[PDB]
Amino acid sequence: FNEFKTPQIDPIFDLYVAYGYVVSLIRGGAKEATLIPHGASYLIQTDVSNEEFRHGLVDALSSMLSLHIALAKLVSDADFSAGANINNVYWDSVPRNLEKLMKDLEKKRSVKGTATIPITLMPSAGKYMLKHFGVQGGNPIKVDLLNYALAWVGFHYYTPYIK
DNA sequence: TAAACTGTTACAACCAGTTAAGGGTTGGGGGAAGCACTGGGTCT
């Protein structure tokens, strides 16, 4: 077994990245696996280290890009781009994020940077956050690229939305 | 000089007959179903 560790942020985005983990594992096999909910941890029990998790993730990401291209800068009708996203800036940030993910996680190498977190994935996300008196010039909260992609795939594939 | 004795207190028939107990006609029209105010990202 591997006991894939999942960081704790909030039981909305954390459940989204858990959905991404479980969908990536079920994509490509991963038999005799289970999901153990720990309030917010939402851990996975599977007997594999990393082969089929990569296979399922790349398959799901290829399907993501295909759906984005099929749907119509690079605004489309995709759920993960404009079907649920309320910001016009997201309609262009999602294509570039997916393109960067394609350029990064295809030659068997890890990620190198991070990304912002949107309202749809986590309602508690915003560029203005106070610490003691006021807010900063940027956003202290950041999400890893792999975690961001898994949250995106979980949001588009699992949670339902009404527009 | 006395102060109603007694059989009797209605019988019998019958105790609504029929007919219909709404007929019709319309069962919300017609408008609107939040107007703004608060914008979140990515860059210089």
UniProtKB/TrEMBL annotation:
Task: Specify the domain of life of the species encoding this protein.
Answer: Archaea
- Official protein name in the record: Type I-A CRISPR-associated protein Cas8a2/Csa4
Q: What is the lineage of its organism?
A: Archaea, Methanobacteriati, Methanobacteriota, Thermococci, Thermococcales
